[PDB]
Amino acid sequence: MEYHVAKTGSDEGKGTLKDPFLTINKAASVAMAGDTIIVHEGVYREWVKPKYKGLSDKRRITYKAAEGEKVVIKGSERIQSWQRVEGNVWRCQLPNSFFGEFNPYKEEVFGDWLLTVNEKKHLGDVYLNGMSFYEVTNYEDLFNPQLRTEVLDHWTQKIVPIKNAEQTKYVWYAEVDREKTTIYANFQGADPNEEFVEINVRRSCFYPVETGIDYITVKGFEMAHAATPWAPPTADQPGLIGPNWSKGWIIEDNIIHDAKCSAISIGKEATTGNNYRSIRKDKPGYQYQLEAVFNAKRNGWSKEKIGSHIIRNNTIYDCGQNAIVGHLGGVFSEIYNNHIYNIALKREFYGHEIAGIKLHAAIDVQIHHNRIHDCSLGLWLDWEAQGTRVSKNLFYNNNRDVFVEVSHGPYLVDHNILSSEYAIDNMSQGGAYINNLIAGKMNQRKVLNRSTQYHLPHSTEVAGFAFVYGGDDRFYNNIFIGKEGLENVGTSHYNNCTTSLEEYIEKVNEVPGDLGEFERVEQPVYINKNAYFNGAEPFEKEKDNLVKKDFDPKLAIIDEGDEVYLSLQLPDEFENIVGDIHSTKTLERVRIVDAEYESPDGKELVLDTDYLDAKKPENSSIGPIALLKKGNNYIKVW
Amino acid sequence: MEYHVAKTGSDEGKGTLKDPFLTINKAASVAMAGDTIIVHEGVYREWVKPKYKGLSDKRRITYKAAEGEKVVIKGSERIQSWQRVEGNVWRCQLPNSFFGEFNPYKEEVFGDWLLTVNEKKHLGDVYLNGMSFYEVTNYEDLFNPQLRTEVLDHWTQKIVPIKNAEQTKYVWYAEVDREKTTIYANFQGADPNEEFVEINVRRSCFYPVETGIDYITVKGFEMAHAATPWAPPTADQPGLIGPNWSKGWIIEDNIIHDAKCSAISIGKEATTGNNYRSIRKDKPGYQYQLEAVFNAKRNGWSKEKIGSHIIRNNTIYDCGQNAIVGHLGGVFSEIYNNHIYNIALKREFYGHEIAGIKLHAAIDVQIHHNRIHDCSLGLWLDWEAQGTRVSKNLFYNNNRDVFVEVSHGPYLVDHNILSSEYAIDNMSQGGAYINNLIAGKMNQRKVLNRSTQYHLPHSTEVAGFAFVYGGDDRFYNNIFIGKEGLENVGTSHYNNCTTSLEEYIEKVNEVPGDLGEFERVEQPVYINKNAYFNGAEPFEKEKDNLVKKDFDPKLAIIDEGDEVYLSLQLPDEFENIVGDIHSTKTLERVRIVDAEYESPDGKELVLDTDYLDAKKPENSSIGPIALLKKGNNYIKVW
Amino acid sequence: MEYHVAKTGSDEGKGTLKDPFLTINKAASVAMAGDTIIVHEGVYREWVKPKYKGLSDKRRITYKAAEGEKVVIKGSERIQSWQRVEGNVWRCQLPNSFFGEFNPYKEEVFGDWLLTVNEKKHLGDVYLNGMSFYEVTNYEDLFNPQLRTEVLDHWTQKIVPIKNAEQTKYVWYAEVDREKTTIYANFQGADPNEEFVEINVRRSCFYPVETGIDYITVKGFEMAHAATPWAPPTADQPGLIGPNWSKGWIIEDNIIHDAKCSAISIGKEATTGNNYRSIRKDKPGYQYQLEAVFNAKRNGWSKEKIGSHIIRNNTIYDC
């Protein structure tokens, strides 16, 4: 059945093209496997809750915007009952019943790893013609807010410009008592009843209220203004849109924005752990997180039941925690051709869960061909990045590009453009960095007081757990570019490491013993055919490299809106360093997990296509794009 | 069917009382669930291999010695083909076929955690009228061996007397080529063909060659001379007798001795891990051990299929590694009323697997009413001692009594007599030490570089894994006795610990954060109503205790052969301390595992009977025996 | 490491091309993940038992015949100790130790779903210049066997031609006592000591004795004459060659023949069920089979641990 939803409809109707339903949730309450729901032009202010599940990739339930029609799903409501208090501050008042059981003005940003605990923030928000406001703590702060033009990036401790300074003068404050919710805001001269002013009301826009609602496709919608909660790996992880612990969703061709915390969630649900560290306070989030993995294994977490979602061709921006988030629920998923930007720039709250994309246990997840910029952190893979492949992505204008934490691999980072000045946080082992352009520093550190799980290949089955001893990384065919005063760009971080698993084994076994003898020897690194320009430094034992500290590539990423270009100068010597095609055969297995770099189906992986998807021969230029050559280069990269 | 085996029988017979079989293995090849095999007087030189399984506790397959008859199963053969070489050295030669696939003179003591790697030892042995010999490395060492009267105990680094000094002059050496096995030995003047001289030949005496041969009872035999291999938790763990990865055995009323390494094994089998650290050399045994736990979970390791064995009323002695050993295969078992002595005293080889009883993952195992003495280490619980209860045991004349390593509890040590000068090695957390007599030091240490599993209660299901942060121990009603020059007796070890979980939580949560904030606060200890004599020292914050540094109890354990007595003097103030009866209600839950001290069935545990099995009154005196009193005490304890 | 095995070798050698081992099982006892075992021209009368496992599709242990060389692994032995009894019937006698723990002349074709219960058959066999014989039940049946040219196909109940009619006149019968095995056979006029006469001896040709020996490749061999047992789904299922409950084998480019029952087995092992219907007789094989599926699931039967084998480019016949 093909159901239709339109603003001329009725929920008492048949749901046909000629007698359509009025709300998307009515269609969601009757559609069954194989059905399609076509939504016609309009703004639908509701939280859509798919009731029945799709039964296979063939028998999905598809929700889509009608061809050529603009369909918006919003979690907000327009408010036209404001009254002027004094100056530019206005006030509205609503019955608590307006919000039901979830009131964004009462609910706080709260939970494990949230660090800004002194100034409480809430899940509400106020918008003036689409622009969100900044929450203030006290009524008095409403009247003469100060324009701010700079802000401290918490992780890098660097003062950076505020992207939208004017927005810093628009503030809101609310109070909720037993009966009413009262919201105040400074509109800086505008009349909020005349302008288009909205407030957050609902938690999500498209998200099942039961788990296991598999095989849903959601396509072609604009979705916005969701009061989503802080979403650490140790809690339920709702988002503006997400599968809620199920398998096989396809979220595509959507424009998603203004999720308070995370926009798309492919995370976990509450029964396997819900902020126990913050509520019970007896054990740290670290301890409760490794327990949640086993709780989930008992609650069906496996390829058969959870994951294998596809998130493609979406534009996601202006969210406070993440464009995409999730622990466990994203295993075996694919994330590609998305444009992600402006994530967590307002910095109203901070904690260790923020990034354009953050995934915990991203087992065999493929993240490729995405454009990620203007984020405090572009991508964060945290625990169990086993089989994960980050390939052919464009990262720029981020405070940091990529962070791979407490993982053991095998994980692959290939053919990417990592152009920010702080390119990689590496608190893992088992990585392979192949054919990337890396123009920023790498902070590489061991993690000896946290052990985290590893798995059987291509599975959620647990094989063991380990601490991060550091090293056991491969770097081949990368172009590194440093800059004045910037330290730690390149691969010199590994200078004390062994250079082969054979050397490591020989050194450890020189004197009889067990763990202590292994701990005294540094793990191997496999590094060759990299170039180092403008201050980047190589691993001292690399055999074949090109080092020209004096050469300045003058790299620039030029964003022209829908298109993006890369400008780069390369030295004549670039023609003389040639890269090999890497594959499962050429990449040494990781030591602790004892696994190969394979495709998700267990077959050989061959890295013979570049960032522009051009097939390359046996001997080609190093770096992400085969077309790069000595001299001037100007290449369209998006 | 009741099958009979007798030395007047025939394996071509019917196996009845009137027409009995000749070998025990013939009966083992035909007996089925519910049958009994009765073995008549004689020495049976064979390895019995139960073929079919018992099907329930009711439908067991029972192997027993005929009432009032002496039945011996031996892995050796008597050798009467010795020829004098020179002096007191004699030689015999056998075809390699005499040993089949397993030749003790070729097989080495080998594997993970074996520390004596310089001079290789083998699994063979030579006996003169029952007395085993010492292996020597070179042919030349056979001729004038030197009497040794003292030896270094490896762990304690103390020089101690050799129990049987004369035995040190009896030595053997062997060579195996592609055709023959040649064995040389110094008989110090005796004629080995006239005396009764035996050599090890077979690996085991009573042990299935297939796993899953459940519900077998083995009763009333003497078994001896088995060439058993080094048995670490990361390898197959064969023994002289054992269930070989199955459920429900009862091993009772047997006299077992002269197993090269371990005598009774309730350990694991090879498919879940087999000396990978020693063979592959890429990862430590630590890493391969935690992997073997998950390999076994996938290979049916659960209460439904493995464990629940009963080992009772046996006498086990003169073994080189352990009287009882086992990783995983012993879950939910009961070990009681056994007499274990002379374990690993020859010190021909050493490594981290030696103890009278060593069990890894002794989940809900009950070890009680055992007499363990003259061992280098009496009891070693290593990893996953969750629910384990060590109660009413008698430990004396051991270099060390009890070692609980890398465990998280809840584990209970109650009403025991630990009389050795080095009483406890505690490298765990989550313990409860209740009503013991502890006359030696405790070495307590954190373990921050190894994380090990913990489980759901009463189950093999994995709940998580943790490092040992130290503390989270309970000590109530114990009598501690120090000695001149002996440090670390008592509970002062915990002086920097918090005194309740409430205090720990309040201190950790003073400053916001996660794991680092928990790590900076010491775990709680629950200590009260203990006595400290002769130099023992208390936890400074203990509220109610009795400390008399100048009172000397003059403890003595008097072993008269079949009976043992405890001689102890107590001060007048002794009965001023009134101990409480401890139970699930009185014992605070362990922190990391978040579990209670319960009975194996999940119900309340009440510690209301003492070492002599007397019911304890609400208002009892402390220590292991309620009848202890001020003044002189002379009590039969065995 | 690339190990070599050749008839000019020694198991006391290093196992290199210049100093090769003599038996394939010697190489199988030392090869580790990533190694290759190259076997040179010859007939290897042994049961090869891979000891260590391969660790991935990349780090396999590969056993292969040397390029262009004919390598045969057989479970039989040639017998040249035949004595004529009478007419065309000859006899040989072998101490039971010649067979060890598995004697094909004692072992019966037995088990769940076997229907020919009246006349017992055994796992032994006799071959004359490669042609197997037909077992007969009694000593007297050896002397004047009758040529048969048609036979009843049991399922279809149709009488069909016997493909090799002449073979029906070649019969064997054996007796096993406490000390030795006596095998009789009618050679129809040929001298079995002069012709090439073989008898089954070993159960398998290439099969691990432990389960979990993953990622082995076996390529390019001729393998033949294995005394394999009846292999229903409710029993251990050994074959002439097989992975024995593991993952990732590649069995390719081999010529396999004359397995008594099954040649290549990718079946189950004994612990999940072993002819309980036939031995216990309380429940049918149907009931025990559905139970074996759950017993195997508890034992880790899953894509991660079992299966994903490749059997390709082989010629398998006369089983």
Ligand SMILES: O[C@@H]1[C@@H](O)[C@@H](O)OC[C@H]1O
């Ligand atoms: O940190 C942000 C930076 O990455 C860029 O997007 O400009 C705006 C800043 O707030």
Ligand SMILES: O[C@@H]1[C@@H](O)[C@@H](O)OC[C@H]1O
């Ligand atoms: O390279 C970084 C850039 O991408 C942006 O985020 O501003 C801060 C710089 O350090």
Ligand SMILES: O[C@@H]1[C@@H](O)[C@@H](O)OC[C@H]1O
């Ligand atoms: O040896 C190769 C291995 O790398 C795997 O990927 O399968 C293909 C094989 O050819």
Ligand SMILES: O[C@@H]1[C@@H](O)[C@@H](O)OC[C@H]1O
């Ligand atoms: O260490 C041993 C000690 O515990 C006692 O048994 O006497 C003999 C010593 O070897």
Ligand SMILES: O[C@@H]1[C@@H](O)[C@@H](O)OC[C@H]1O
């Ligand atoms: O107390 C110990 C005793 O039990 C024996 O082992 O000899 C050494 C002493 O330290």
Ligand SMILES: O[C@@H]1[C@@H](O)[C@H](O)OC[C@H]1O
């Ligand atoms: O593989 C995907 C398939 O599962 C889906 O149905 O359509 C899109 C494809 O990319």
Ligand SMILES: O[C@@H]1[C@@H](O)[C@H](O)OC[C@H]1O
């Ligand atoms: O003046 C402050 C303003 O700068 C910020 O954006 O919102 C908080 C206000 O108090």
Ligand SMILES: O[C@@H]1[C@@H](O)[C@H](O)OC[C@H]1O
């Ligand atoms: O995940 C499931 C949860 O959604 C349901 O509410 O409770 C049962 C769980 O298995």
Ligand SMILES: O[C@@H]1[C@@H](O)[C@H](O)OC[C@H]1O
């Ligand atoms: O356990 C995760 C940890 O590795 C990271 O630092 O951020 C906090 C949690 O998301």
Ligand SMILES: O[C@@H]1[C@@H](O)[C@H](O)OC[C@H]1O
């Ligand atoms: O690089 C991309 C890879 O990462 C993805 O998994 O499959 C498509 C490729 O182009």
Ligand SMILES: O[C@@H]1[C@@H](O)[C@H](O)OC[C@H]1O
């Ligand atoms: O400034 C934004 C830009 O970064 C994005 O790429 O396109 C949308 C603009 O609002």
Ligand SMILES: O[C@@H]1[C@@H](O)[C@H](O)OC[C@H]1O
């Ligand atoms: O299970 C029974 C056990 O409880 C008892 O102690 O000994 C006999 C066994 O059959």
Ligand SMILES: O[C@@H]1[C@@H](O)[C@H](O)OC[C@H]1O
């Ligand atoms: O003391 C003996 C020594 O002389 C011999 O070499 O090795 C065996 C010991 O018992």
Ligand SMILES: O[C@@H]1[C@@H](O)[C@H](O)OC[C@H]1O
């Ligand atoms: O992993 C075990 C370890 O904890 C102990 O020290 O002995 C070695 C192993 O048996």
Ligand SMILES: O[C@@H]1[C@@H](O)[C@H](O)OC[C@H]1O
């Ligand atoms: O430890 C316990 C012991 O004290 C009691 O006497 O018998 C049951 C055991 O579990």
Ligand SMILES: O[C@@H]1[C@@H](O)[C@H](O)OC[C@H]1O
């Ligand atoms: O220690 C004693 C031992 O020496 C003796 O041989 O048998 C009894 C044991 O208690």
